[PDB]
Amino acid sequence: FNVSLMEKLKWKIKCIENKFLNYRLTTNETVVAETEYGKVKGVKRLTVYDDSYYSFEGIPYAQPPVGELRFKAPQRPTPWAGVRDCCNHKDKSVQVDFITGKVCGSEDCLYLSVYTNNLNPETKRPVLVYIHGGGFIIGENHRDMYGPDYFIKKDVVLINIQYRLGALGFLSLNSEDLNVPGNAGLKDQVMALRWIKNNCANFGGNPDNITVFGESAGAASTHYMMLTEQTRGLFHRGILMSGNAICPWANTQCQHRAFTLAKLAGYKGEDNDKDVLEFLMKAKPQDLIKLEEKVLTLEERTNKVMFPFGPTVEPYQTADCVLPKHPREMVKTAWGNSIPTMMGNTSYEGLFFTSILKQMPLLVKELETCVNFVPSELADAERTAPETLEMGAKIKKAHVTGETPTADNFMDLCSHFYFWFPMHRLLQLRFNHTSGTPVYLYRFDFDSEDLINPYRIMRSGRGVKGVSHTDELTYFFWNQLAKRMPKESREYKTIERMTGIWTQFATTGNPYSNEIEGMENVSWDPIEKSDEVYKCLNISDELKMIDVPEMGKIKQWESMFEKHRDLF
Numbered sequence: 001f002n003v004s005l006m007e008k009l010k011w012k013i014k015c016i017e018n019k020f021l022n023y024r025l026t027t028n029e030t031v032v033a034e035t036e037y038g039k040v041k042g043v044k045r046l047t048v049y050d051d052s053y054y055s056f057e058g059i060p061y062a063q064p065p066v067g068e069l070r071f072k073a074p075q076r077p078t079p080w081a082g083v084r085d086c087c088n089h090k091d092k093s094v095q096v097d098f099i100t101g102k103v104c105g106s107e108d109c110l111y112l113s114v115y116t117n118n119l120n121p122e123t124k125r126p127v128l129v130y131i132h133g134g135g136f137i138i139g140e141n142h143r144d145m146y147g148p149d150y151f152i153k154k155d156v157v158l159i160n161i162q163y164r165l166g167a168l169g170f171l172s173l174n175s176e177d178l179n180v181p182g183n184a185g186l187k188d189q190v191m192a193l194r195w196i197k198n199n200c201a202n203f204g205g206n207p208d209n210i211t212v213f214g215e216s217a218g219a220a221s222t223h224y225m226m227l228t229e230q231t232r233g234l235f236h237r238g239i240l241m242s243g244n245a246i247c248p249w250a251n252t253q254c255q256h257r258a259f260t261l262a263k264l265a266g267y268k269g270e271d272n273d274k275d276v277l278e279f280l281m282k283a284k285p286q287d288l289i290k291l292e293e294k295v296l297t298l299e300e301r302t303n304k305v306m307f308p309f310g311p312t313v314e315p316y317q318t319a320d321c322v323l324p325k326h327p328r329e330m331v332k333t334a335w336g337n338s339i340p341t342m343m344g345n346t347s348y349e350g351l352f353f354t355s356i357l358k359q360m361p362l363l364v365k366e367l368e369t370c371v372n373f374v375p376s377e378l379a380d381a382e383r384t385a386p387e388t389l390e391m392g393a394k395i396k397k398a399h400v401t402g403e404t405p406t407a408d409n410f411m412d413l414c415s416h417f418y419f420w421f422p423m424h425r426l427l428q429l430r431f432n433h434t435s436g437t438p439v440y441l442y443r444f445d446f447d448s449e450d451l452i453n454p455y456r457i458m459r460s461g462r463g464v465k466g467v468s469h470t471d472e473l474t475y476f477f478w479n480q481l482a483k484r485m486p487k488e489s490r491e492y493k494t495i496e497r498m499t500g501i502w503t504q505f506a507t508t509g510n511p512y513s514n515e516i517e518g519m520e521n522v523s524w525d526p527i528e529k530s531d532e533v534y535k536c537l538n539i540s541d542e543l544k545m546i547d548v549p550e551m552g553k554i555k556q557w558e559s560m561f562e563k564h565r566d567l568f
């Protein structure tokens with residue numbers, strides 16, 4: 001699973017190019033802004049499209065979670081006299097670099113970045129807050145991956161946050177005396193959102209008009225931020241891009257896995273929460289993150305647990321508790337059910353798993369009965385119960401198109417298991433607990449290899465057709481693999497469309513505007529509870545409202561809950 005020497009060298013070359021471009025697009029125009037915690041100094045930067053924006057990076061929203069603060073809820077940062085230099089980014093959270101294979105980052109990572117094309121707008125502006133994905137184990141707010149260069153064409157304030165990843169963000173212990181209930185990384189997000197609420201006006205933002213959005217684990221995070229009581233009314237729109245909290249990969253009960261991690265790292269002693277914590281508290285952070293890949297058992301991997309540490313139901317209550325119940329239970333009471341909401345997925349999500357399939361062809365044989373993809377809550381432990389075989393058959397008829405299952409059948413199935421089916425479950429649960437504010441659906445169906453992002457390397461997608469999970473990021477954010485596209489190019493037009501639609505929705509709670517090219521004939525209605533078939537804006541070279549192509553398969557997955565409706 002090591003990225004090729006060829007791509008490692010391409011990547012090293014691109015990292016160097018990025019350093020020089022970043023320098024070249026820096027200006028001498030520094031500015032100072034006020035915050036609750038003291039003055040911050042930022043700087044204007046340029047874009048390759050000859051735009052410019054004010055950039056503040058490395059604004060702390062919490063105390064560095066180091067030493068005794070490791071694995072704990074974030075605390076408010078210490079204020080400062082004088083001016084804090086925010087003209088440079090800070091480290092990303094400790095994580096494995098997927099190109100190099102080496103551990104990178106720092107425990108000192110609780111920062112956010114703020115961007116706008118005008119620090120003194122004549123009216124206060126929509127504030128968009130992006131939470132990055134990466135399975136809660138990788139990711140950053142560095143502009144080599146999430147550059148604001150496209151968004152700042154619009155009159156908005158854009159904020160990109162970091163939050164703790166991996167075991168450092170998501171360790172969880174049952175022992176109440178130890179104050180490690182879990183979800184430290186989601187609590188990081190909460191404290192970032194509180195900072196934004198109370199400070200965005202200083203950068204020209206409207207604190208009464210905040211939109212939180214994210215993709216993949218960032219979408220699950222956004223959803224968590226819409227579910228938890230901790231954030232009630234902190235913001236006003238939400239966009240879930242290819243994920244939510246009901247996704248099987250987006251939460252896990254990981255309380256037993258701390259001991260395993262400790263033991264991988266050399267711990268000698270018994271499985272006792274306090275002894276385990278003390279060992280983990282002294283370990284080098286890079287040693288723990290490097291070994292995180294080894295934590296899951298054969299059984300857990302088989303049963304489709306994707307990450308050893310992630311969002312979890314906390315075993316006891318604390319003042320900072322974010323997830324006191326399972327996400328489905330949390331939907332039934334969520335304040336965020338009553339704010340304008342947009343959700344979507346790409347047209348071939350499962351293509352994302354091309355790399356894993358290449359290395360483990362045997363996975364395709366799982367579709368012979370499909371029992372491993374039956375939702376874990378329904379399946380028996382060995383996945384041999386006659387009921388489990390029955391449910392797996394429903395899945396098999398949904399995705400296997402011939403006598404022998406194919407790799408494409410596998411990836412199609414993945415689209416539904418990991419993304420479309422959780423979306424369906426969320427929409428149906430939400431309809432029974434909402435003021436009635438609208439939810440809009442999109443389907444991202446624009447395929448190009450003329451402009452890409454780094455995930456395409458991770459998924460072995462060079463020369464591969466189809467719109468994978470993460471392919472839409474390319475049209476939202478600058479990354480170091482990008483380039484200036486001709487303004488009449490289909491790629492450039494898609495950048496304008498995506499940032500336009502998101503800015504339009506952020507502003508009004510309605511993603512339609514006849515000011516967007518190609519939307520002239522679009523009648524984009526939100527989903528109603530009585531709808532048997534979901535309507536979505538399909539985003540390709542043309543913008544077209546269609547019934548969701550995935551609907552039939554979605555209903556087939558739902559039928560597995562025929563005799564278990566209370567679990568749907």
Ligand SMILES: *B(O)c1cc(Br)cc(N2CCCC2)c1
Nearest residue numbers: 133134135216217218249418
């Ligand atoms: B999104 O943050 C996301 C979803 C899935 Br499913 C899997 C990942 N990974 C797996 C390998 C690294 C990130 C991310």
